[PDB]
């Protein structure tokens, strides 16, 4: 099989900057004056979208800031000026021979100015408590960069190992991320304690932000 | 416009078989140069697995050749994927895709939406849906956050909309996490004007097709 290796595997670039992704094939994808390398853009939750075919042809409807070059074993996808909607994983694909193979993917995000999260906390619902479990949810909304630290405290005891978190894709509307963390406790443990706090550290905050509630009030 | 719509995803036991279909609309299936299946394991890249060209010739990736069949039903304008002896490596989103009559054929300009196949021995379980009520502790300025917690389901996926799809601004539906119980959990939140909480209804619409569980949950201040 023809193996395709992309470089880099991920990059972050200021909005409007030029971005270059390279693909190297383990053997030539040239045939009779054309080069059979293709490029796709895959946005989160979506099927890949074809950008470039036969190494340098722009697919209909694709913006002209995307272009492809190269021949033989070495190919480049260029975004001439990165736009906020261009957050995606980009894949090369050879169509010179079966099995048709894809590179491993290059993740591209827009590097915007630092933005601190808005932090919100949700106690467990009474409906859930009826069932014997309590989930406490902390939301960090609209922040940049993606790196953030959430610490749970219950009556000032640091919780470790009983929470999970999840981060959205970069939002093209403002190039931010959001994050949800869930602390899970038994109902009996939840009813044994009073103060529930989520403490957030992030580059946009000069000191950590704590959102908390008191069970009951 | 040509549209490709996959069906047949969901949970399959290891050693079982999958049967997927791709219904083509807005385009006659006999006019395509080739029809294809391409799959993507969670968080991994893309693997072409099978093609059928307009003359009916089929071809398979040797990574799965021997337990895969592609076929077409022109009268239903549909083509199919069958795979047997499934293993955990086969858990993936399966896409259908159309090849081209031009420029070497084997690049894919038209794709379906993908359907997730999960190969596991576990049982289907539909979710519980709990409110994330707006309160003083979920307010910043004149903005309030509220949401729904979609807890303890298997397999993926679940879809969440708000107000039947009419509410899209400020919505963030998070990727599900797999709990140590073997069940998924996810949350969907929306930020809205604090002044709307008394007057605007907010309903989250949850659908877990693997268990045929649909829930509409009204979320209001506590």
Residue numbers in the entry:
A (entry chain L): 1 to 217
B (entry chain H): 1 to 222
Paper text:
Immunoglobulin E (IgE) plays a central role in the allergic response, in which cross-linking of allergen by Fc∊RI-bound IgE triggers mast cell and basophil degranulation and the release of inflammatory mediators. Omalizumab is a clinically approved anti-IgE monoclonal antibody that binds to free IgE, also with high affinity, preventing its interaction with Fc∊RI. Instead, the Fab alone selectively crystallized in different crystal forms, but their structures revealed intermolecular Fab/Fab interactions that were clearly strong enough to disrupt the Fab/IgE-Fc complexes. Mutations were therefore designed to disrupt two recurring packing interactions observed in the omalizumab Fab crystal structures without interfering with the ability of the omalizumab Fab to recognize IgE-Fc; this led to the successful crystallization and subsequent structure determination of the Fab/IgE-Fc complex.
The structures reported here were the result of unsuccessful crystallization trials of the complex between FabXol and an unconstrained Fc∊3-4 molecule, but similar crystals were also grown from crystallization trials of FabXol in complex with IgE-Fc. In the first interface, with an area of ∼395 Å2, residues from all three heavy-chain CDRs contact VL and Cκ domain framework residues from a symmetry-related molecule; namely, the VL domain AB, C′′D and EF loops, and the Cκ domain DE loop. The second interface, with an area of ∼324 Å2, includes an extensive network of hydrogen bonds between an edge β-strand from the Cγ1 domain (β-strand G) and a short segment of β-strand structure in the Cκ domain CD loop from a symmetry-related molecule. We first attempted to disrupt the interface between the edge β-strand (β-strand G) from the Cγ1 domain (Lys214–Lys218) and the short β-strand segment in the Cκ domain CD loop (Leu158–Ser160), observed in the FabXol1 and FabXol2 structures.
